[PDB]
Every structure is written in C-alpha cells, then in structure tokens.
Amino acid sequence: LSEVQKMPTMIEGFDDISHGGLPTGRSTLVSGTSGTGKTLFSIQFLYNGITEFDEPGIFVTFEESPQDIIKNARSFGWNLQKLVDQGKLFILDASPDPDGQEVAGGFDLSALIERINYAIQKYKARRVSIDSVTAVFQQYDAASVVRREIFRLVARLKQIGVTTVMTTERIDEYGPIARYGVEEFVSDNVVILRNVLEGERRRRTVEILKLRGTTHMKGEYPFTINDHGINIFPLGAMRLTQRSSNVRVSSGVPRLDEMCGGGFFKDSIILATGATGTGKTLLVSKFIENACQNKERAILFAYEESRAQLLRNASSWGIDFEEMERQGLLKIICAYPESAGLEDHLQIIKSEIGDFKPSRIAIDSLSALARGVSNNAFRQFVIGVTGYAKQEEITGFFTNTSDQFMGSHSITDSHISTITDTILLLQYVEIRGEMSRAINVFKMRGSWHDKGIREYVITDKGPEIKDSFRNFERIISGSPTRITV
Amino acid sequence: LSEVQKMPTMIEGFDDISHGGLPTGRSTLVSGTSGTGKTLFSIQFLYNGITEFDEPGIFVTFEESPQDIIKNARSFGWNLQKLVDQGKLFILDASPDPDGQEVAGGFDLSALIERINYAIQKYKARRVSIDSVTAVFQQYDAASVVRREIFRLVARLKQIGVTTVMTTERIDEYGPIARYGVEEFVSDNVVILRNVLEGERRRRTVEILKLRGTTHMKGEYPFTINDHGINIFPLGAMRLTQRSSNVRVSSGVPRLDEMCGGGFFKDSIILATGATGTGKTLLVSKFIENACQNKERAILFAYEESRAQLLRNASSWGIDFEEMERQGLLKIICAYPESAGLEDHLQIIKSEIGDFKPSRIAIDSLSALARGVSNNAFRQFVIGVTGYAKQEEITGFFTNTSDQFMGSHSITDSHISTITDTILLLQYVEIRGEMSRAINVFKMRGSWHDKGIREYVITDKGPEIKDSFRNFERIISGSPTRITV
Amino acid sequence: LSEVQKMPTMIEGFDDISHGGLPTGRSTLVSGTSGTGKTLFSIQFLYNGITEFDEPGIFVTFEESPQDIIKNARSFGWNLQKLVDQGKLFILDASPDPDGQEVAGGFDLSALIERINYAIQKYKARRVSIDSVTAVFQQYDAASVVRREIFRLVARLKQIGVTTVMTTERIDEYGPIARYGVEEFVSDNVVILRNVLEGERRRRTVEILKLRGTTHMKGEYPFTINDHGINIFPLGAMRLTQRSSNVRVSSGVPRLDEMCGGGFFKDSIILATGATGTGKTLLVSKFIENACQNKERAILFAYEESRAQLLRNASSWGIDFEEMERQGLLKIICAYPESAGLEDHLQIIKSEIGDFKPSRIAIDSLSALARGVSNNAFRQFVIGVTGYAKQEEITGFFTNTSDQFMGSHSITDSHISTITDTILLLQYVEIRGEMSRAINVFKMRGSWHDKGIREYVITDKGPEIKDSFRNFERIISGSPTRITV
Ligand SMILES: Nc1ncnc2c1ncn2[C@@H]1O[C@H](COP(=O)(O)OP(=O)(O)OP(=O)(O)O)[C@@H](O)[C@H]1O
Ligand SMILES: Nc1ncnc2c1ncn2[C@@H]1O[C@H](COP(=O)(O)OP(=O)(O)OP(=O)(O)O)[C@@H](O)[C@H]1O
Ligand SMILES: Nc1ncnc2c1ncn2[C@@H]1O[C@H](COP(=O)(O)OP(=O)(O)OP(=O)(O)O)[C@@H](O)[C@H]1O
Ligand SMILES: Nc1ncnc2c1ncn2[C@@H]1O[C@H](COP(=O)(O)OP(=O)(O)O)[C@@H](O)[C@H]1O
Ligand SMILES: Nc1ncnc2c1ncn2[C@@H]1O[C@H](COP(=O)(O)OP(=O)(O)O)[C@@H](O)[C@H]1O
Ligand SMILES: Nc1ncnc2c1ncn2[C@@H]1O[C@H](COP(=O)(O)OP(=O)(O)O)[C@@H](O)[C@H]1O
Ligand SMILES: [Mg+2]
Ligand SMILES: [Mg+2]
Ligand SMILES: [Mg+2]
C-alpha cells in the first residue's frame, strides 16, 4: 500500500551504499567467509537500533553462546549486558545443547520460529539478527530442503513484520554467494562481506548485491573493523559541496609564494613531485613550519622517514619540530605503508584530523602508499583523502617520488595529477657536471603562477630559489644543452 | 504457416538486441545470478505489454509473495495493484504454503499448468512470466527429471499459444547458463543477465544467447536498473543518420576560432588534450561562457574538480558561472568517475541532456572516466556519448589529460582521436627555462585549420593565443632547440 | 563481566600480530597444509607457557606418538621429557590403537573430553593443544556431524576455562580454510599457516583471520622455522622509535666524505647504485676497511662474489680482509640469494648482527636478493633490514646493480631509493672513446652534499675522486657532448 521504506542501520557508510538502510519488514542476507564481520554486522545492527531509535532487538545465536556475544561486543565499547538487563535486547540461545543427542528427523524450524515470535511479542522487537543459519542447515544437507526452510523462516518473519538480518556462510571469497547456493535467492536482500587476500594482505569489502524494490550503490566497498565497529567508506563519499575560497596560504618559502601568485590556496591540494633528494620533504617541512609559526595546527603524515630522522633533518634545516610538538601545534604521524591497508590509512588520517582539527596537513610520499597496491585502490584512497581534506577546508600538501630520476616524461606514474590543484615539479638538472635542482610550478588552478624552471639550492636555512636556466635547452630532460649568448 | 513473429517488450534496448522483441507464442529463458534483474525483467515484460498494447499478463511466483511483488514494482513507478484490480494482471501465487508439509512424490507440474491455463483463459492473457522455476525444480534434484518437466511446461504453454518468460538460476556469472544445465536447451530462447564483478565494481550486462528461428545481436550488452526499470544500451545504438551541417559555433576564444577557420562546427566533437595545467578546463569554461552569452543552454560534465572549485577558477578567469546557472542557461554536473559505472554515467548524461535540452555539452577529462576501466568499455562509452550528442545536433567539447607531460608521442593513450572531429593539442614548451604553453589545432574534419603551434598565456581575462614558435625546432618534444635567425 | 583478555604465546612475532597473544579461555584454530608447522606451533605454545609463566599444558595427539613428539621437540632445544617428569606437561595419547578394530558408531568425543578434563584438573592445566582433530573427524565424513562435534569440544573446553589450540587440515594453500569447511566457523579464533609455492620456492606465512572480540594485524606475515621454533616477522616490526643522531662516520674515501659534508651519518642507510664494474664493491670494501681501522666491528653481507674473490679484490685494492677477520673486527657472510628465502636472509642478518654486535654493516648487491622475488616481498625485506639496522644504531651500506649500464633513467628499478638516506650514483661516462666512471652524491638527508658529478679512477690504492666534467653536457646519458671553452 506504500513504497519500500528502509530502516537506518547507522553503520558508518552502510546507509549510504544501501540508500537509507535495510528495507523495513524484510530479511537481509549477510554472507561472508570466516572473519568477514557477519556477527559484528548483526550485533551492530541491533545495537545501533536500540541506542539511536530505542528499537528493541532480538539476537538468535546457534554457535556463539550469549555470554560470549556480550563479551565480544565490549571490544567496541558496547555493553550488551546493560541492554539485556533493560529488556531492550534479548539473546535467544538456539545453539545445540551438548546433552542433547543427535536427531535423525528434520530439525524443527517451527519451534524456533515460535520462540522468535514469542520473544518479539514480549520485547516488542523491531529488529532481529540471526547468527549462522548455516549451522542450522548443515543438518539439512539437501539444498532443496535448505531453500524450503529459509523460505519458511523469511515468510514467517515477514508476516511478523520485523526487519531481519541473517548471517550465512561461504567457502570461497568470489565463489558461490552462500554455501548451498539457495540462500541468496530466497532472501529479498543480499549483503556480501569479503576478506579478499591480495599481495599477502587482507582487504575487507562490503557489497550490497540486491535490494528488492530499492536502488543501491553497486560493487564492493572497502570497510574496516575498529574499536567502533564496522566502518564503510562509499567510494570517496561521492562529491558533496565544499565552497572553495580565494584565501591564500603561505608555503613557508616566500619566493615559492611569489611563484604561486601569492602562495597556495587554503582550500586546495598541493602535490610536490620529483626524484629522490629533490627536496620534497624540505618543502613539506617548510610548509608545516609556516603553518605553526602562524599558530595554526598541522599534521605530517610521513611514510618513509622515521620521526627522529625527520626531526634531525628539520633541525639541520633550522626547523625545530620538537618545540612545535611541545606547543601542541604539530602532530607527526609516521608509519610504514605496509603496516595497514589503504582503507586503514584513510581511517587513521580521518581520525587524526578529527581529534586534532588541523588547518593544514602534509602527507609525505604518496608513492610510498602506492607500494604493492593496485592503481585503482590507490586512486580511490587519494580521492578519499583529497575530498576529506577539502571538505574540512584543510590545505593538503602531498609528495610523490618520481620513479625516474631524470627524463621523467610524466608528473606521476599513478596519474594523480588530475586530482591535485597545485603541482610543484622538482627535478635534477645537469649543469657543468654538477647536479643542480630545479623547481617549477607546473600547475595552479585559479591562480597565475610563474612558468620559470628556477634553480634552487638546499642550505641550512632551507631552500633558496634562484633565477631560471635562461641560457639552456632541454632542462626537462635533465641534461640540458647550453647556448652561447 | 508463417515466419517467426516477435512480440515487443518495450524494454529500452531489449527490442533492438532481440530484433523486434521476444518471439510470439514461445518460452524465453531469462537466466542470471542473484540481483541480475530477472524478476524485474519478467515484471517489466508484463507491465509494458499491458500498458502499451493492452495485453493481459500472468505472473507466476514461487518465492516472492504477490503483495511483495506489487510492493517491489512501485520503486519503478508501476502500480501493479491497479492492473490487478482492473483484471489486466493476475499474480498466480504458487509459493509453497508454510502449513503444507513436505511431499516425497514428484511435484505436480500438471496442476500448475492447469491453473495457468485456467488463468490465461479467464483473463485472456497473451503474456506469461514465471518467477524462479528453479525453486520448483530443486525438489527435482535429478537433471533428467528437470529437463522433462521444463519440456512439459514449455510444450503446454506453447500449445496454449502464450508468450512466456521463465526466470532461472545460476551460481557463477560465466559458468553454466543455468543450475542443472538442462534449462537452456529445452527453452527456445535464452537470455542471460550477468552482474560481472570487475575491479570491485559490478557491471550488469544482458545477452541474448539464442532466438530459435530469428536473428539477434550477439554478445553482452550493458544495462542499468533505474527508477524506470531495465535500460539496455545496444552497442552505441548502431550508426543511425545525423545530417551534419556546416554551421559554425564560436569557441569563446576569437583567435582559436580564427585558428579553426571560423570556429567549431555545430554538429561536431571537439577534443582538447594535453598535460595537466595546460588549460583544458579554461577552454571548456570559455566554450560554456560563449554558449551562454548567446542565450544557448549548455551543460558541463566535470569529473575532477568540484562545483565550487570550478566556480572559483571561472571567476578568476572573469567568468561568472553562478549568474549563468541563475539564468537557467548553465547546468554543472560534477561527479567522481568511480561513483558509478560507465553505463550509469552514460545514462545520467542522456537524462540530463533530455531534461535540459542543451545546445552544447562539455565533458571534462574523459581520462578521469577511463580510470580503472577496460579500454573496450571506455571506447564503447565514448562512442555512445559522441553518437548521442551528434544525434541531438549538440556540440560536444571533451578534454583528455595526457599521461605524459612532455614528449607525448600520442594524442590519446585511449586512442579516441579516431572518434573526434576536432582535436586541440595543448602542450608545455620549455623556452629559456620557462614553461610556456602551446596550442595547436591538430585536426579538423571538413574545415581548414591553422597548422601553427601558437604560444598562449593564461591571464585573468582568459587565454591569449600569441604567435607561433617560428625560431625553434622540436617544440613537440617539449624541449625545443632555438636557431639563430 | 570483563573485556577479552589475551594469553601471550611468546612466539616471536605472533603476539604482535595477535595484539597480545591468544584470547584466554577460548579455542584457537591453527589450519595449514602438511609441513606448515601446525604441530610445531601447538608444541611451542605449551612449551613457552610452561617455561615463561609456569602454566601447565596439555597436549592431545591423535597421530604422532608421545615419544615421537618429545623426540621432535629436541630439534629446537626443548626437553619435553623433563617437563613431563616434572608434571608440568602431559601428552594425552588419543591415537587409535592398532589392536583396536574399526568402530561403526560415532567416535566417542565425550570420552576424550572427559579424559582431557581429568588431565586438566590433575595437572591444573591452563593451556591445551590438540593435534590433528581432522584425524578424529575423518571417521565423521559428514560435515554437519563434524561441525556439531567441534562445537561440543569447543564449548566443553570453554566451560573448563582453558585456552586451547586446535590444529586442523587443508588440501589447498588458498582453498578452503579447513577440510570440511565447518572448522573455521565453530572456532572463535582462526590462524592459517601456509607454505605457498612460488618460483620453485616455498614461502611460509602465518595469518590471523579472526580473533572474535579483539583486534589483530591483518593478512599474511612471513615466518621461518629454525632451531628456536617459529619466528614471525610482523611487516617490518612497524615503526618504533630510533633517535637519529648527527654523528658523522667516515666512508673510507676522504674525498667522498668531503662530498658528503663530513662523511655519512652513523644512524643512516647508504645506497651505492650503478652499473656492473662501477666500483660499488670497492666502496663497500673501503667502508669496511674504515670501520675496522677505527677498531669498530663490521659485517659484509655479499651475495654475488665468493669470500676468496672478495679477499683477492680487496688485496688488489690494498685492503687486507684476512688480517681484519683475524683481529675479530670483520665477519664476511657471503651466500647465493637463492640459497634461502628473503625471510631466511633477514633472520640470518638479524642473528649475525646479534652475535657480532657490529657498528657498521655492508650488504652487497640488493639487486642479487631481488632475483626472482616479487617487488612487494623484496620491499618488505629492505624495510626489515633498514629498520633493524637503524634500531641498533648501525650504519648500513647497500649496493644495487642498475640493470641498464648507461642512460639509466632511474636510481633503482625496485624503487628502494625512497627508503635510503644516502644515495651514491655510480655511472660510466663515455669520453673520447674511453669509459670513464662518475660518482655523484645523489641524495643525503640532513646534510649538505656535493652536487658535482665527479670523475674517479680505480687504482691499486682504491678510488681517486677527481674533478667534475665541467665542460660536458648529458653526462647522465652516459654519452656526454663536449663544448669548447
Ligand atoms: N574492536 C575491534 N576492532 C577491530 N576489529 C575487530 C574488533 N572486534 C572484532 N574485530 C574483527 O572483526 C571480526 C569479527 O567477525 P564476526 O565475528 O563479526 O563475524 P564473521 O567473521 O563474519 O563470522 P564468524 O561468525 O564465522 O566469525 C574478526 O575478524 C576480528 O578481527
Ligand atoms: N527502482 C530501481 N532502480 C534501480 N535499481 C533497482 C530498482 N528496483 C530494483 N533495482 C535493482 O534491481 C535488482 C532486482 O532484481 P530482480 O528482483 O528483478 O531479479 P534477480 O536479481 O534476477 O533475481 P532474484 O529473484 O534472485 O532477486 C536489484 O539488484 C536492485 O538493486
Ligand atoms: N629445528 C627446526 N628448524 C627448522 N625447521 C624445523 C625444525 N624442526 C622442524 N622444522 C620444520 O617444521 C615443520 C614441522 O611442522 P609441524 O610438525 O609442526 O606441523 P604441520 O606441518 O603443520 O603438520 P603435520 O602434523 O601434518 O606435519 C617441518 O616442515 C620441518 O621442516
Ligand atoms: N643543510 C643542508 N644544506 C643544503 N642541502 C641540504 C641540507 N640538508 C639537506 N639537504 C638536501 O636536502 C635533500 C633532501 O630533500 P627531501 O625533501 O628529503 O627530498 P625528497 O624529495 O626525497 O623528500 C638532500 O638530498 C640534500 O640535497
Ligand atoms: N588568473 C590566471 N592568470 C593566468 N593563468 C591562470 C589564471 N588562472 C589559472 N591559470 C592557469 O590555468 C591553468 C589551469 O588550466 P586548466 O584548464 O584547469 O587545465 P587542464 O588542462 O588540467 O584542464 C593553471 O595551471 C594556470 O597556468
Ligand atoms: N687495481 C685496480 N686498479 C684500478 N681499477 C681496478 C683495480 N681493481 C679493480 N678495479 C676496478 O674495480 C672495478 C670493480 O668494482 P666493484 O666495486 O666490484 O663494482 P660493482 O659496482 O659491481 O660492485 C673493476 O671493474 C675495475 O674497473
Ligand atoms: Mg622524502
Ligand atoms: Mg581539468
Ligand atoms: Mg659487486
């Protein structure tokens, strides 16, 4: 008599991919291999319901004992025992009793359905989570029997009018959606949780395969499990709207600011690319030093150099990062790119930005984060970081180490130049057998910028941008040819 | 006694691939994994029949309850309850009753066939849709029994003379066409719906494998599910006929118009390619500004820069996009390439063009749309966009960011240059250690165009195209060599 | 009533990936193919418990006889017989007796559980290891029966309150986690041991798939089995904190030290890259000679040249490595890269550093170690070596043979330049048909360094760094062009 209403799950990123949550009064199928977060998803569904909408929830477990479920939920800061004592949550223990011997007859799904209905009526439950129906159906080896029993369960829960989340099982990550293969077709809604193993690394993704009668974002979306539960990131949080401003921000190098027409833009992304030793880290350090000298908070996400090495280099360049950190203006987060996946790094960056509320951020060596990851996943990560930084009106400074040290015919082999607003090209220039460096403002959207490929030297005082090689040809090749007069 | 007549389905793009629709008086097999749109296809078949030809339809469901089918159809704006009340549609509920216990004997297909025949005679039905015969046949584990029962059903429905759509099931996207493997050979017509997972993205494709006694377009064809149902796009809508005209349209840069022999052609595709920062977005902005200054509607499909960043850059270039939007002359659609698949982007572009009726369109950075997609799918998308724009007599301006910033030996690594009519090559030119830019009209079909590689500078007033580097060699390499006199 | 406490295993690297060990009072599933170290892991778990925390352990074996288990443990220096005699360890022999005939009834898991409970009560056991439950469950061909029995066992061991390690079985390295496929879902914790075969080489990795109610590091982590048991290396031991100092260390070439602004840094990584014959080994030899002349211990990890060939070349260069070794100041470890995997090489390097306590280390030809290994695994190895060296305040000198001998447009095709602090670029320079060499300090973090591409010749006295090619262009190409005056 009406359209397909949805019930928000309040799981970060799930409601966005599901376009409003799970459909109301229907059964949703959550399928995934071991460790994919099925139990976590089901528990978070009820917990969020109870906490945000005061909707009593029912949890049906067939393997994990209720005590173990409550003990598990605490790792996320969830006190399920408090909810149980308040009558808001009820954990229906349907696990086989050890004292109960094997039964040769078809397991009584009718008794379980009656118990669930009684619990729903008693606690006025609006949400139901069913843990590992596959444990129930393994006694039902036949696939037809399994489909019939799932159909009975879904139809009964539908007649009761409760929103249900059923966790099922799969052997392969990209094989059958569920074990028997009849689970994904009896359910109205199918959610797939994967733990893809790529490059000796586990990537967790969530996919909404079908929402009968409703639109949803298609494909796999990476998600992480942290102290707050499941955190899904829908493809860079789409576009949104961030009103870019003309406000200028200094780069810490006055000559570079002149080269940029008055410094960088506050709501812009700066990309300093070049070969190793070109001074990208020096520009990042001067950027952070300028940020903090103006009593503005900043963060330095490093991924190649340790904290102490950064400190030593900054001190050698006349920058006291220790005093900056003591003043509470600078927070240096360094970490090896491998230590965690790109989604984990994005979550850490978001959390640090939220806790510190910085005005500027400097990520060192995006190339380091691109190690051993597919170009598509890397691009998704950069989209996420850039969008999040622009949304908070945060000035971003990113560095990318070019793989070729001279003759580099591309700005970035990952092709992130299309996403950045300002591009600083740093390169070596062979001059009289000496390896001079050159800095050029390759790109600046919305601002005039010096086209000069200007020489600069690195001293104890920082970078000193000199004149341009106005008597040389093919500087870009790294090996220019000098012309008389 | 006659040839093989076909019954139109009126599903956008299906009748084209099927060369007139589904054959009349025969059973069509619609096979696909979970969430492929089998139920949607079957429902749309009957709904389109009833609404466009007043042909009563019969829907046979074995899992989804009739109430749920009616509730599902509303997401597409279809009021199936109205049709049921009018006697034009009948939903035959054949789902197993929960109160009915298991039956050890072969399920009575004869009773179902008799019920379907009675319904067809009562409602004078010309169309029939059968939902998940696989649910029926899972009780028939044996494949031979399944083939026999499908043969009986198809033969009976054929004797009745109704056009039937049967939805069947598969475990793998590219595995067996159906579960048992006997379904695709008893049916006269086989349609395969796939939800291929590639690059963490779901691509939906429809394939007509065989139409016994009729020709059909071969292979997979992408299709999307939106608020209007299934929308199939047959390989760029073939050729068609768009009478190109000699009418000229200004580019917003008078010197560029002179370089093009009087501006671009109205019914032509313009491709501005170059490295990052070369000013492709500037040319797009001037193009849109010229379009709107002449009181002509235009659309800007951006995929790298946000709306506000485009606004800021345009204002910095003396272009007021806000006033343009207020006047109803400009509509700016920006969106990340990942947010949706290429078919979805094509559908969005088509819908926006239809709703706005623009005279010009400007897509920013086709390269952004090529991220993480196969070259073939990208090429298909460009063919679609170019053909649709040319059909509506719309002038298209596309930008492609070259992956190499100097020495680019190709116009486009995706090789779309063969599809575009006008090509504007933008490149950096190293001159006296300064990174000057160069604009050249690489290509212009049906018009004389300046061969000069002309220098241009970007100011607050826009691009100023200066003279050509007439005293330099190897400009194209990016690092030219100057010659005296 | 409390959070999820964990029990340390004291297995090197396991507690780090598991974030504190195995959860207390729960069953952990250790699955892996033949030879993956399941039995070794289970035995080490109990042995470490007993030896470090005085926690009595119970070992349940179904195939390996207790005598054979004790005999096996001695290869790691573990005297399990001493623990058994002390009552700290009990090996419960549950293997089928040869005199016991086949049983058609379901094997009595209840009797085994009662025996285990009796043993736990008698020895006050806190840890339990179960060897090859799969041998038990093969008589239970049915997967449902297997899941039920595993559930009974886990629930009973949980009620007893002991931490349990259960070793299960798999046929494929990346196939089902366990044989039946029900083992990984009844267990609260799943650990996967793999012996991946890549390039005719076996790579052993450990993965913690899920720790219910606790966070853990995700993905595969390489581990080796040596005379001390399982040794896991969690992704380079994360970041840690190594306070870099400004202390300078001589390179053995005074002119090179001048080029580096006073020599290399003590807590830094030096990378000498160049074509074959450029003199990387000469720089390594002079580095070691300077290390030992100052009465400082050093190690030379070679991977291309034999010990005697290194001796001969050093003597030809006026360096007496034999006297250095006799004095106990130099230890030369040479070995073919293939002889062992990257994890094995890392373990050997760590062990040698620990036994010798060197002040400097010189690894010859990282490129040799990159032969036939994925770039990701190689990068992980370099991260490990660099981090370990920096942690011990050890100066590292690494050499990388460039694959291209002239025109090399990159420092390292493996792109390790981002990880190194000092980069010495060695290259050939064609001059008047003579193949002169050139040395340039490409990079030096935290120090001024000469930008000059200086010629050097190799004599019996070592390298003699001459002036720079100040009258030549395109030296970097290898084929420079001379200019008059
Ligand atoms: N506080 C936490 N922070 C981060 N990750 C956590 C946290 N608690 C649990 N996890 C992770 O979440 C996963 C838990 O999965 P969950 O129990 O929800 O279901 P599942 O793995 O889909 O199915 P199964 O019931 O077979 O375990 C584990 O792999 C664990 O690593
Ligand atoms: N209004 C809509 N707009 C866009 N997509 C929709 C809309 N309504 C439904 N969908 C999508 O269409 C799909 C519905 O598939 P459908 O029910 O027709 O059959 P099927 O997936 O082939 O088979 P099954 O019966 O197993 O679900 C879902 O995956 C859903 O995402
Ligand atoms: N002292 C040692 N040093 C190095 N490697 C060792 C040592 N002792 C044993 N190994 C290795 O450890 C492995 C022993 O594996 P383990 O017996 O622990 O269990 P598993 O291989 O997982 O299972 P299974 O019970 O089927 O053998 C062997 O492959 C052997 O090469
Ligand atoms: N005190 C100094 N004087 C002059 N140059 C220095 C000094 N300290 C460091 N440098 C230079 O700084 C360079 C490092 O720059 P950095 O920003 O770390 O490069 P990257 O592009 O890899 O981030 C060194 O290669 C060296 O040339
Ligand atoms: N006010 C201005 N004056 C001169 N140049 C400008 C001005 N604003 C922007 N630019 C130039 O515009 C360039 C951006 O051009 P754009 O069309 O966005 O490049 P793309 O080819 O990436 O689309 C900047 O790199 C800068 O050189
Ligand atoms: N006594 C010598 N006099 C001059 N040159 C020598 C002498 N002994 C060896 N060389 C030079 O040393 C080079 C080897 O340098 P080495 O460090 O082994 O190169 P790599 O970069 O491969 O490690 C030889 O190619 C040769 O040019
Ligand atoms: Mg750096
Ligand atoms: Mg652009
Ligand atoms: Mg060598």
Author numbering:
A (entry chain A), B (entry chain F), C (entry chain B): 19 to 503
Reproduce text from the manuscript describing this model:
In this study we reconstruct and analyse the ancient circadian clock system KaiABC (anKaiABC) of cyanobacteria that existed ~0.95 billion years ago, when the daily light/dark cycle was ~18 h-long. KaiC is both an autokinase and an autophosphatase that contains two phosphorylation sites: S431 and T432. KaiC phosphorylation is correlated with the dual adenosine triphosphatase domains located in the CI (1–268 aa) and CII (269–519 aa) regions, respectively. KaiC is the core component in the KaiABC system which can form hexamers; KaiA and KaiB regulate the phosphorylation of KaiC.
Likewise, anKaiC also forms hexamers as revealed by cryo-EM, however, the cryo-EM and SANS results revealed differences in surface hydrophobicity, conformation, and interactions between the ancient and contemporary circadian components. Dispersed differences in the surface hydrophobicity and structure between KaiC and anKaiC were observed. The sequences of the detectable part of the anKaiC A-loop (R492–T499, S-shaped loop) are almost identical to those in KaiC, and they have a very similar structure in this region. However, whether the structure of the remaining C-terminal part (R493–S524) of the A-loop is similar remains unclear because this region is so flexible that the structure cannot be resolved. Differences in the B-loop (A112–D126) and another spatial loop (S150–A160) close to the B-loop were observed, although its function remains elusive. anKaiC harbours two clefts for the binding of ATP molecules in its CI (KaiC-CI) and CII domains, similar to KaiC. Although the inside surface hydrophobicity of anKaiC and KaiC are almost identical, the positions and orientations of the side chain amino acid residues (R165, E187, D206, and R230) surrounding the ATP molecule, showed subtle differences compared with the features of modern KaiC. Moreover, subtle differences in the position and orientation of ATP molecules were also observed. These structural discriminations may lead to functional differences in the catalytic ability of anKaiC as an ATPase, kinase or phosphatase. The ATPase activity of anKaiC is much lower than that of contemporary KaiC, which can be at least in part attributed to the residues T233/N244 spatially neighbouring to ATP molecules.
